Amino acid sequence: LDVNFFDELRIGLATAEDIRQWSYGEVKKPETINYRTLKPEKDGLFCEKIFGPTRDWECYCGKYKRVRFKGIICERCGVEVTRAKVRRERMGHIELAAPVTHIWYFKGVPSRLGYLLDLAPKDLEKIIYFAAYVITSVDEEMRHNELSTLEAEMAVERKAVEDQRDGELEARAQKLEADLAELEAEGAKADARRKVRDGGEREMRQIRDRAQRELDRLEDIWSTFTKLAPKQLIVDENLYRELVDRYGEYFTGAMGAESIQKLIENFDIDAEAESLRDVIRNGKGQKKLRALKRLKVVAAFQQSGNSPMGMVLDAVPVIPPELRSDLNDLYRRVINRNNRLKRLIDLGAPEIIVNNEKRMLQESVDALFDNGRRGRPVTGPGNRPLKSLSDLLKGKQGRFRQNLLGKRVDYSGRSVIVVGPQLKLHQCGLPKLMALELFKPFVMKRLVDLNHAQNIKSAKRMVERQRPQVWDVLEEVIAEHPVLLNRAPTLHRLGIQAFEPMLVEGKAIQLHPLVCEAFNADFDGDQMAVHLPLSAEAQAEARILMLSSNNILSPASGRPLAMPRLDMVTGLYYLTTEVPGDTGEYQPASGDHPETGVYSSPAEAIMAADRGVLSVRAKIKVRLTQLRPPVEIEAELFGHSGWQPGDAWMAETTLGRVMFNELLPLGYPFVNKQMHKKVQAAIINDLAERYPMIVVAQTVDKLKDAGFYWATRSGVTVSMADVLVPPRKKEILDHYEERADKVEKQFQRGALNHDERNEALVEIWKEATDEVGQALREHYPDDNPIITIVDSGATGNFTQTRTLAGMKGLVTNPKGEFIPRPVKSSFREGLTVLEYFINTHGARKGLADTALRTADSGYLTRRLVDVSQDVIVREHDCQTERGIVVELAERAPDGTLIRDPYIETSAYARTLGTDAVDEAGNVIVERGQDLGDPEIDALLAAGITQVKVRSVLTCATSTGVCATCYGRSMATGKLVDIGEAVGIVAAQSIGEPGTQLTMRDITGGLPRVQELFEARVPRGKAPIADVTGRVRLEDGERFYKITIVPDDGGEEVVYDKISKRQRLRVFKRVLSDGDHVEVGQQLMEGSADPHEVLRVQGPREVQIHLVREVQEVYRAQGVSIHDKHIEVIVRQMLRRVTIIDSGSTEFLPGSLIDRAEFEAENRRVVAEGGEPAAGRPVLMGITKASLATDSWLSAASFQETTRVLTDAAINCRSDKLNGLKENVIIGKLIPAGTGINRYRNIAVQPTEEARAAA
DNA sequence: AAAGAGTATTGACTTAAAGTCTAACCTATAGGATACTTACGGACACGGCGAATAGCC
RNA sequence: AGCGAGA
DNA sequence: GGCTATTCGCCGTGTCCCTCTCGCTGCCTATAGGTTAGACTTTAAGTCAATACTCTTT
Ligand SMILES: [Mg+2]
Ligand SMILES: [Zn+2]
Ligand SMILES: [Zn+2]
């Protein structure tokens, strides 16, 4: 059977010997099962004598029927009596009467047979489908001697044909003499005599033409010989049969697959490989390019021990009888045609019939291995293609991406989800029936242990009728058993989290609200699947790694994802905001009474608020004795070691803020700020950074509770009366309609064309839009429900508010342009019919655009994951000096350090490569620090901008990356572990903001991202500066010519065809003709292809370019992704070098070889004679990088299955099963996280003191 | 010390099963001779190939 | 195999 | 003067197109051999039942 001894997996061409070695028999009849008794036939497609017994442990006839007869073969029927399941294991084989060629190596462009034999594809096809003869052997020296003899014999034949030729000419002459005698002897017409005479000499012209035909037929054949050599096709078999009958010897010409077999027999690989290598080394140009193409496959066969006989097949293997009859029918066709061929050869048949039958057999094998590849697919009942033996493997519905990496699983459930706010963050409701069913084994065990049932089957009966006693035991068993909750699609790592389940009454998984965002799961009919870990390892993994309370911060940007939002944030905003002039406010008036605003303790404040005296949102002064004061008050009152739990201090704030601040931990200082969602996020981020995660969970949960309660009390409701239109709307409408009418009049006088007036109206109405928006904003009070919800950060944006009251605005044309009408009505006021009809365009287009974009995003994520499927941490530190530089703050022209806007995703969570230096002073922060917020603050304060940080790009470790160079784990909040699969995390983080990554020709959306990671030359390829020099732009419409005089160098280069419509990117000032340029300044407007920038500026500059561009496109929509994930991908992109000089070491020119292996070869060859094989770095798309891996089982799982398997087979490639996809497919443990060889084999034992306790 | 039950004998009766033989009834194969002798989306990418010009035979 | 539908 | 090679264009074929879930319909005749199936005649295995003696329990 099989064990863990799978260290290496090998694929290769299977020779006929191997095929008949695998087979346990030889099916030779097209009979599946008897129509009447319904049993397999002898020697059929389901023969029990071959593939085993249908029902286990008896032969066909039944002489032996029990287990003790194990491994015995019954003499009567020959069935080996054993287990029945072996029918899924044993193979047959069909011994083809004539050879056939495997399709994959024939039709898959480039035709590997064609390249191996150097036969043109059309030619080869005509050979192997019996349409044109091919020679396979020829003669040499005796060829010379009989060529002289044959020169004499063709002199004889030419003389004979010329003799008949002149005899025909003389017969013409005599018939012409008779004709002229008739013409000029009898009385005939003046022209009729010349009619017959012209006709006669016309007959002679055709006779001389026939002569020329005979000449041709002889000398052309002689010329065919005089330069004859094999592998030479001959169409028009008439010439072939002529040659054979005249030249039966001196060549052997064949037709079909066996012809190719013979061609491969008389084919020495070493001589052809040497000749091709010589041609490449000395010959240049297109000829070299083809010769290189063939050398690929020719070397593939040379280096490996597999001979090219495997391409032509003598026997076809028979898949075991589980396929069970679409595919089976194809097999029947093959067997029918093979048997008929055998009979035809036996009886003795004309060449035509047997040749046609051979062609039919070839076509049948073709259809079997791949139906529809060549010619129309073989169709079945209902006129549909038969699912060929290869269609099982390819596509979405192929075996690789429906059944191997993705499987359906037992012990799982699914239900709709309903918000439950009463649950703790680490809990999830689970309906009683679903839990009972899922846990039916465990509850059975417990109720048999409890003696509620006598035995297992009685217990199973007990549960199947849900007897009343089986609920208490159920509560006992479910306790302390984690469960995973997935919500498809799992866009990112936080799509699946482990909760502790709890029973709930009715049929609905009660989810915790705070994790809603993590799932993006919103309660209107989403269905969340539930999975149940079983093994001790799985339960530990779920309880520890996956627990919902253990994953608060996003793995992408680390911002808290359990943060309160929507309702809770609104409640907190209402609680912590301050309303001057409210009841119970503070007033310091004296001379008549005290301030009457202060309170002894917060408890006093709540007791007053219970009375209708103190509002929760009034300014007051409370003597706090249990909340830590802010930094300044602590530093003033206590200064050094203020022990707050007993100390008291006077706080001038609102009671609501006090009630809030009690929810934070004891150590957190008093905040005293209005709780915008932003401020909440900052608070939670700081809390997670400082305090342990469990505290973060508890605080977040308390926050949710308070938020919901106070949102209920917040008094936020929507009514028409609460939606206040702006009173100045009509005046603005008139004011801007006046300009619109003016533009209409100017157009009606021909002042401007349609496009110009469309743009003018667009501008006028957009201005009107902004004006009414401003009027509405300033018209609203602050306490309004709508402004309250929007401005608190709870949800929605002011554009929606403005559309709700005021004016919706310009509506998109279904092409994408702007309707110049535009809509002038608020939804509150109610849109008119035509305004609504115009509006529908935009919404329908948006909905449509969502679908295609999510499809493309999913595909992109698949690509990125595959490329990064093997980027996992391996070492703590490589100590590599190399690093990248990040700018941080930029010097102000007046002199000042303004923090760079995009610092939170660039330098945060990075390890310093070199010690910081200040004014050539001491080190503020030395090498090897996480560079968390205080560090960057210190650097900014001291006055340093550029800092050298370590990154994955400049990581010295060959395998994966090291912990330090990668930097901080964004999710865990500390340094990375030695098993984290940072590659998968990176890719998923890039892909997650898909769809929400929208757009508004050079691309700028998800297509632009794809292009950046695909290395595709952009459409708007703006030229870039190459060498510093004064520019001499010339004027060419669509073909700007651009000269640049090199500062030092060679020759200025002019760019023949560059688009004029672009706008020159500004330089040190707008870039203009006559200006000295840089080595990288973008000349024109638009992007630049990354290959060019690489070739100009080395690997570092192209790296920085790619990261900057992708980050830009993402930032353009406001999604924050840390730079490091991108760095990981671009690192994966730059790992291969192109070979210019082969040196003398097995490196074909143009080969894409890994840099680590490149260096290894170099250190191998420096000794024993040095031949440095020069190479240059190169940038290759994500797809190519993935498909260039050293693992065929992963590349095959990825895409374009047929080609990758054919290539790997020809190379006899062996997969070492080191990646993640592979380990998934074969079902052994991934080498990542808890699977690597340092954790996978930990030894655990008690202590000697513990043994003493025993 | 007595009685009842179990562990044996033996014969007597009984029924499944099973090994021949039949028979008859399906079942698989071959053959049929006046003369006729031709069907019925769209984008990316690479590799197999138009149009040109110059040099060499 | 084909239809329709939810997220 | 013509053909081929080194240089461009041009066109054709192949590959890909997110995930998860729910319900419903689609001529004839002649030979020879197998074939089990079906009944007859054996068994072989099973069931009943008389009898009696010995051992254990009350
Ligand atoms: Mg929803
Ligand atoms: Zn048998
Ligand atoms: Zn490193």
Side-chain angles (χ1 to χ4, degrees), chain A residues 2-6 8-182 184-323 325-755 757-816 818-889 891-893 895-999 1001-1059 1062-1067 1070-1250 1252-1254:
Chain A
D2 301 301
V3 284
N4 206 1
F5 291 62
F6 277 57
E8 194 76 67
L9 171 70
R10 168 163 312 133
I11 166 178
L13 272 165
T15 52
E17 177 269 357
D18 280 331
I19 326 310
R20 68 178 47 84
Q21 191 211 57
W22 299 337
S23 90
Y24 285 85
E26 189 273 322
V27 305
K28 54 170 64 55
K29 318 162 33 173
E31 320 194 340
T32 57
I33 275 175
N34 190 349
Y35 79 111
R36 187 194 63 144
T37 182
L38 308 192
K39 288 178 73 183
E41 301 308 316
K42 289 307 191 310
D43 252 2
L45 318 87
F46 292 76
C47 184
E48 277 183 346
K49 186 177 182 294
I50 306 167
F51 311 97
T54 318
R55 275 305 309 119
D56 55 354
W57 283 304
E58 71 272 19
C59 67
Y60 191 106
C61 72
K63 195 62 64 219
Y64 314 82
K65 54 198 66 56
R66 287 273 48 80
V67 190
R68 72 193 293 274
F69 313 88
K70 163 192 177 189
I72 319 191
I73 300 175
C74 170
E75 54 251 55
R76 280 290 277 290
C77 44
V79 176
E80 147 55 13
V81 163
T82 173
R83 197 78 64 157
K85 64 94 179 173
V86 305
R87 289 179 64 81
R88 324 169 55 72
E89 164 138 359
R90 308 169 100 91
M91 289 213 67
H93 85 286
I94 307 162
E95 172 43 276
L96 296 177
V100 73
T101 183
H102 199 286
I103 185 168
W104 270 12
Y105 323 110
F106 164 55
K107 197 68 180 176
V109 63
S111 179
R112 281 99 177 167
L113 269 310
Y115 274 12
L116 182 84
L117 301 323
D118 193 20
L119 270 285
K122 322 294 185 299
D123 310 51
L124 185 77
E125 187 267 10
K126 284 189 283 189
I127 321 311
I128 64 159
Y129 274 74
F130 303 92
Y133 284 97
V134 303
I135 319 306
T136 63
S137 84
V138 181
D139 294 19
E140 298 81 33
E141 271 310 291
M142 83 321 295
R143 195 266 296 157
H144 293 90
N145 74 22
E146 194 189 286
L147 186 150
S148 79
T149 316
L150 280 187
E151 177 37 45
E153 169 71 29
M154 319 325 130
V156 165
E157 186 174 359
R158 171 50 61 79
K159 183 65 175 66
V161 300
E162 194 70 23
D163 164 78
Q164 172 43 298
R165 187 260 192 178
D166 77 16
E168 293 147 4
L169 300 177
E170 164 170 11
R172 165 74 274 160
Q174 189 54 224
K175 191 164 84 72
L176 186 70
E177 284 183 352
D179 210 336
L180 67 88
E182 178 181 2
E184 278 292 327
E186 286 78 6
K189 194 162 51 54
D191 191 64
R193 62 188 84 263
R194 297 331 185 115
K195 289 304 302 182
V196 295
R197 201 174 284 89
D198 179 4
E201 65 87 21
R202 204 92 177 74
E203 313 192 70
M204 186 201 212
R205 206 183 336 279
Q206 281 85 67
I207 287 160
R208 276 208 192 90
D209 289 8
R210 214 167 291 130
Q212 309 150 9
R213 300 289 186 277
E214 312 329 311
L215 326 179
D216 188 5
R217 220 175 61 77
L218 195 63
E219 71 254 9
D220 170 36
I221 290 178
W222 189 251
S223 56
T224 302
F225 184 94
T226 193
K227 47 190 73 170
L228 199 163
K231 91 155 60 176
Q232 162 169 340
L233 64 166
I234 173 174
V235 302
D236 189 2
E237 58 84 31
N238 158 31
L239 281 293
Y240 166 85
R241 24 158 278 167
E242 198 292 322
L243 280 160
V244 182
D245 61 51
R246 211 162 269 172
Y247 298 168
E249 281 278 20
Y250 261 54
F251 71 82
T252 178
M255 191 66 66
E258 83 306 347
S259 64
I260 324 308
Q261 179 181 47
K262 196 50 50 180
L263 276 181
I264 295 172
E265 289 302 350
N266 57 4
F267 180 83
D268 54 348
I269 208 171
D270 72 336
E272 308 298 270
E274 169 279 334
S275 167
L276 214 53
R277 272 152 193 293
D278 201 73
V279 164
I280 298 299
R281 259 193 300 92
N282 63 8
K284 314 297 151 207
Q286 186 272 330
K287 186 181 287 298
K288 154 152 74 185
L289 273 297
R290 209 301 304 284
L292 178 52
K293 299 264 200 147
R294 287 180 62 262
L295 172 58
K296 195 206 315 166
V297 296
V298 177
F301 278 91
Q302 165 36 259
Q303 301 201 347
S304 55
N306 227 329
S307 165
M309 321 317 305
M311 326 311 250
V312 75
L313 297 171
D314 165 39
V316 166
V318 153
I319 164 174
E322 307 302 308
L323 67 169
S325 293
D326 161 84
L327 206 168
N328 276 116
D329 159 79
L330 294 160
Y331 264 67
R332 202 194 189 216
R333 182 182 326 294
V334 165
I335 296 165
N336 303 315
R337 296 212 208 161
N338 181 36
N339 279 13
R340 190 187 306 137
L341 179 63
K342 174 74 69 57
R343 303 311 162 291
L344 273 158
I345 82 167
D346 186 68
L347 309 163
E351 171 279 344
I352 294 287
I353 298 171
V354 65
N355 157 10
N356 192 26
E357 180 57 27
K358 284 217 199 78
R359 182 206 293 115
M360 260 165 277
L361 178 66
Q362 170 62 70
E363 196 283 338
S364 50
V365 174
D366 160 8
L368 189 34
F369 291 164
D370 267 300
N371 186 19
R373 214 52 182 90
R374 195 215 81 111
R376 277 171 74 71
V378 169
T379 58
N383 316 64
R384 36 170 298 191
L386 281 293
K387 208 80 71 161
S388 65
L389 184 150
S390 173
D391 286 334
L392 259 291
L393 208 58
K394 313 173 282 321
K396 293 175 65 178
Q397 301 296 101
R399 273 299 82 90
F400 283 161
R401 64 195 56 62
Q402 182 182 0
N403 292 112
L404 296 178
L405 42 58
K407 305 183 175 81
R408 309 195 159 264
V409 306
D410 39 0
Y411 304 139
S412 54
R414 183 198 282 283
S415 182
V416 304
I417 318 99
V418 279
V419 69
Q422 73 292 22
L423 295 321
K424 304 290 142 190
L425 182 39
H426 65 79
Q427 295 181 350
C428 73
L430 212 29
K432 295 193 320 305
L433 74 92
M434 183 149 78
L436 164 156
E437 172 284 343
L438 267 174
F439 286 98
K440 79 176 285 178
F442 300 80
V443 55
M444 170 295 312
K445 175 186 180 300
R446 292 308 341 299
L447 77 74
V448 171
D449 188 3
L450 284 184
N451 303 120
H452 297 304
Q454 290 296 110
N455 44 39
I456 168 164
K457 193 173 183 295
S458 192
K460 283 328 201 192
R461 158 50 195 66
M462 269 307 108
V463 59
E464 85 192 323
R465 298 195 71 260
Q466 310 76 45
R467 295 303 323 293
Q469 65 276 22
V470 190
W471 291 119
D472 306 326
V473 59
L474 189 43
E475 199 196 351
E476 260 175 49
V477 54
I478 175 177
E480 270 66 356
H481 206 126
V483 294
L484 321 186
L485 324 187
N486 158 34
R487 204 294 311 280
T490 59
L491 272 285
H492 59 311
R493 180 181 97 168
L494 273 281
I496 178 161
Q497 282 93 309
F499 301 79
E500 191 207 359
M502 282 322 311
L503 270 56
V504 299
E505 268 80 350
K507 304 190 150 176
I509 295 166
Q510 261 203 351
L511 178 68
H512 195 280
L514 287 168
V515 317
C516 155
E517 168 281 347
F519 292 1
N520 204 77
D522 92 340
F523 309 85
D524 50 48
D526 281 87
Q527 296 172 56
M528 171 173 314
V530 173
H531 302 289
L532 160 51
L534 296 193
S535 165
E537 293 91 16
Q539 275 172 30
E541 262 185 19
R543 194 209 199 86
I544 295 161
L545 292 165
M546 293 172 190
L547 199 75
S548 79
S549 81
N550 306 351
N551 309 325
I552 316 94
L553 330 171
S554 89
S557 178
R559 318 297 153 173
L561 307 177
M563 55 83 83
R565 58 217 164 307
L566 270 160
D567 283 0
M568 296 143 276
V569 65
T570 38
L572 296 168
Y573 183 87
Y574 165 79
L575 171 62
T576 53
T577 182
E578 162 55 274
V579 183
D582 204 328
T583 56
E585 216 189 343
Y586 176 76
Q587 291 188 356
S590 299
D592 44 19
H593 62 77
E595 301 95 322
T596 66
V598 168
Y599 301 108
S600 81
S601 293
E604 201 276 3
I606 292 93
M607 314 139 85
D610 290 4
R611 290 275 281 268
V613 179
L614 192 45
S615 179
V616 192
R617 299 162 67 195
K619 209 168 75 183
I620 86 160
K621 261 186 288 214
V622 176
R623 184 214 287 257
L624 255 285
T625 82
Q626 288 293 299
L627 302 179
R628 175 167 197 160
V631 296
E632 79 298 21
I633 306 306
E634 144 59 25
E636 281 203 346
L637 161 53
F638 315 105
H640 49 284
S641 294
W643 66 294
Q644 310 314 315
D647 297 22
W649 59 289
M650 164 31 50
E652 176 203 47
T653 65
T654 69
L655 171 55
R657 287 169 183 170
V658 174
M659 171 162 352
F660 182 99
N661 268 292
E662 248 181 0
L663 287 205
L664 279 52
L666 72 92
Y668 203 94
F670 204 85
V671 54
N672 190 13
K673 292 169 69 179
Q674 187 174 207
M675 278 333 295
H676 199 299
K677 189 199 259 174
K678 199 171 307 317
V679 191
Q680 262 156 91
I683 288 302
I684 308 146
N685 209 350
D686 177 48
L687 204 160
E689 160 272 355
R690 169 43 196 134
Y691 292 114
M693 53 71 59
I694 183 160
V695 185
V696 179
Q698 310 213 307
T699 61
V700 152
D701 192 351
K702 292 187 214 166
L703 261 181
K704 167 261 281 174
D705 282 359
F708 280 141
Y709 172 70
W710 281 111
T712 298
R713 316 277 155 193
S714 169
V716 52
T717 185
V718 86
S719 53
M720 161 295 298
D722 291 306
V723 182
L724 240 190
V725 288
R728 298 301 320 299
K729 190 186 180 321
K730 176 26 55 202
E731 294 84 358
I732 303 306
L733 291 203
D734 289 334
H735 180 290
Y736 267 91
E737 272 219 291
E738 296 145 18
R739 297 181 54 183
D741 317 308
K742 288 175 73 173
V743 163
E744 196 282 340
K745 187 256 184 185
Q746 279 121 12
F747 179 85
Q748 284 292 17
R749 290 184 305 93
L752 68 169
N753 73 92
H754 92 77
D755 201 26
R757 60 143 268 190
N758 283 19
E759 312 333 312
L761 288 179
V762 159
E763 296 298 339
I764 295 166
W765 287 115
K766 96 173 285 297
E767 293 294 78
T769 304
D770 299 334
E771 311 333 315
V772 71
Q774 195 82 260
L776 182 66
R777 191 201 271 276
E778 59 202 300
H779 175 37
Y780 269 42
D782 168 300
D783 62 350
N784 301 67
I786 312 98
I787 191 71
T788 298
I789 176 160
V790 174
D791 272 8
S792 69
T795 194
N797 49 331
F798 188 67
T799 53
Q800 282 157 340
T801 289
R802 172 256 281 287
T803 312
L804 182 122
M807 189 255 318
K808 164 152 178 46
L810 324 165
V811 161
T812 304
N813 220 17
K815 70 155 290 296
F818 271 25
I819 286 282
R821 172 56 275 144
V823 170
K824 302 187 295 181
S825 281
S826 35
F827 273 83
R828 180 196 196 270
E829 172 273 353
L831 292 321
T832 47
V833 186
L834 275 161
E835 284 165 349
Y836 215 75
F837 191 69
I838 298 170
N839 184 6
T840 50
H841 301 314
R844 197 179 182 96
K845 286 197 298 315
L847 295 208
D849 185 9
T850 306
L852 152 74
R853 98 201 167 165
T854 179
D856 180 295
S857 170
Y859 188 102
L860 179 61
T861 294
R862 264 188 45 62
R863 278 197 282 229
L864 310 210
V865 87
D866 163 346
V867 187
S868 46
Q869 261 277 47
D870 279 53
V871 189
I872 77 166
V873 186
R874 292 284 166 79
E875 311 186 357
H876 192 72
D877 216 326
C878 47
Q879 292 87 13
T880 187
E881 76 301 354
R882 290 178 290 112
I884 308 157
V885 179
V886 290
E887 297 298 338
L888 284 67
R891 300 295 300 268
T896 295
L897 304 321
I898 60 172
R899 155 160 40 227
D900 177 87
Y902 287 143
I903 173 58
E904 294 82 354
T905 76
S906 185
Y908 282 7
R910 284 265 187 73
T911 298
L912 294 167
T914 62
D915 305 335
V917 303
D918 55 348
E919 318 86 32
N922 62 355
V923 306
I924 302 156
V925 54
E926 80 295 340
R927 175 190 179 100
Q929 288 297 353
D930 203 289
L931 203 56
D933 318 299
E935 280 54 33
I936 316 101
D937 279 87
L939 294 175
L940 292 177
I944 315 90
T945 59
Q946 301 177 0
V947 299
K948 196 171 177 188
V949 299
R950 300 244 294 279
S951 174
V952 290
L953 303 179
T954 61
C955 200
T957 191
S958 63
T959 57
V961 291
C962 89
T964 41
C965 271
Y966 176 81
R968 181 173 80 226
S969 304
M970 172 84 77
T972 89
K974 74 202 65 50
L975 194 66
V976 189
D977 313 274
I978 305 296
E980 282 260 353
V982 277
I984 180 51
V985 179
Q988 282 181 140
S989 44
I990 326 179
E992 199 278 350
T995 75
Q996 41 270 21
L997 185 143
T998 68
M999 278 180 94
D1001 168 61
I1002 178 56
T1003 49
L1006 155 70
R1008 180 58 194 287
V1009 192
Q1010 180 176 303
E1011 173 276 335
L1012 294 175
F1013 294 90
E1014 274 267 5
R1016 217 160 40 248
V1017 174
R1019 307 191 57 180
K1021 196 289 201 183
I1024 49 166
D1026 298 0
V1027 52
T1028 57
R1030 191 233 57 204
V1031 66
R1032 206 259 309 184
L1033 173 80
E1034 309 101 296
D1035 294 0
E1037 56 284 1
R1038 174 71 55 89
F1039 36 67
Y1040 270 8
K1041 321 274 181 295
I1042 308 85
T1043 315
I1044 294 97
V1045 171
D1047 270 2
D1048 181 298
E1051 324 80 352
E1052 40 270 2
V1053 179
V1054 199
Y1055 305 169
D1056 49 1
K1057 301 300 165 283
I1058 296 302
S1059 162
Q1062 315 166 251
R1063 298 130 299 287
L1064 284 90
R1065 227 303 308 244
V1066 305
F1067 89 123
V1070 51
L1071 182 61
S1072 308
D1073 181 350
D1075 299 359
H1076 168 246
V1077 312
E1078 293 83 357
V1079 288
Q1081 171 59 60
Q1082 175 194 162
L1083 304 193
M1084 217 39 258
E1085 206 60 57
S1087 70
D1089 61 328
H1091 302 257
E1092 155 58 291
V1093 301
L1094 182 148
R1095 166 173 60 86
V1096 177
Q1097 294 174 345
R1100 175 142 62 262
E1101 269 300 341
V1102 55
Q1103 282 164 9
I1104 300 296
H1105 144 86
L1106 271 165
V1107 60
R1108 264 187 288 86
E1109 320 330 312
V1110 55
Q1111 255 283 0
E1112 186 282 334
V1113 50
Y1114 272 45
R1115 294 152 178 186
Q1117 275 296 173
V1119 296
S1120 47
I1121 300 297
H1122 199 281
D1123 175 292
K1124 84 197 319 185
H1125 313 297
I1126 321 311
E1127 271 176 2
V1128 170
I1129 295 309
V1130 286
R1131 176 183 183 277
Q1132 281 313 93
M1133 182 146 279
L1134 316 172
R1135 304 196 47 64
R1136 285 201 196 260
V1137 67
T1138 49
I1139 303 299
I1140 318 299
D1141 287 312
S1142 298
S1144 78
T1145 178
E1146 307 321 291
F1147 282 169
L1148 310 96
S1151 297
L1152 295 173
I1153 309 290
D1154 155 41
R1155 65 181 61 274
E1157 192 280 336
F1158 186 93
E1159 302 310 312
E1161 182 275 318
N1162 274 354
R1163 36 180 169 280
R1164 185 175 72 95
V1165 302
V1166 51
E1168 160 270 317
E1171 47 270 13
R1176 66 189 320 274
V1178 58
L1179 183 104
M1180 53 214 69
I1182 50 180
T1183 75
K1184 287 158 52 65
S1186 49
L1187 279 183
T1189 53
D1190 60 33
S1191 153
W1192 66 266
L1193 178 47
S1194 68
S1197 70
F1198 183 31
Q1199 179 182 354
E1200 191 178 0
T1201 312
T1202 180
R1203 163 163 101 89
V1204 49
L1205 324 157
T1206 52
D1207 185 330
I1210 293 167
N1211 287 314
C1212 286
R1213 265 188 39 157
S1214 59
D1215 187 335
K1216 251 301 304 168
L1217 329 168
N1218 289 322
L1220 274 36
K1221 209 168 277 216
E1222 308 89 336
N1223 291 256
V1224 167
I1225 288 304
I1226 64 174
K1228 89 167 80 90
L1229 199 37
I1230 270 178
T1234 60
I1236 60 170
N1237 269 335
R1238 290 182 54 271
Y1239 323 123
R1240 189 187 50 67
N1241 45 16
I1242 270 178
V1244 173
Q1245 50 180 355
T1247 145
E1248 84 298 355
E1249 173 280 338

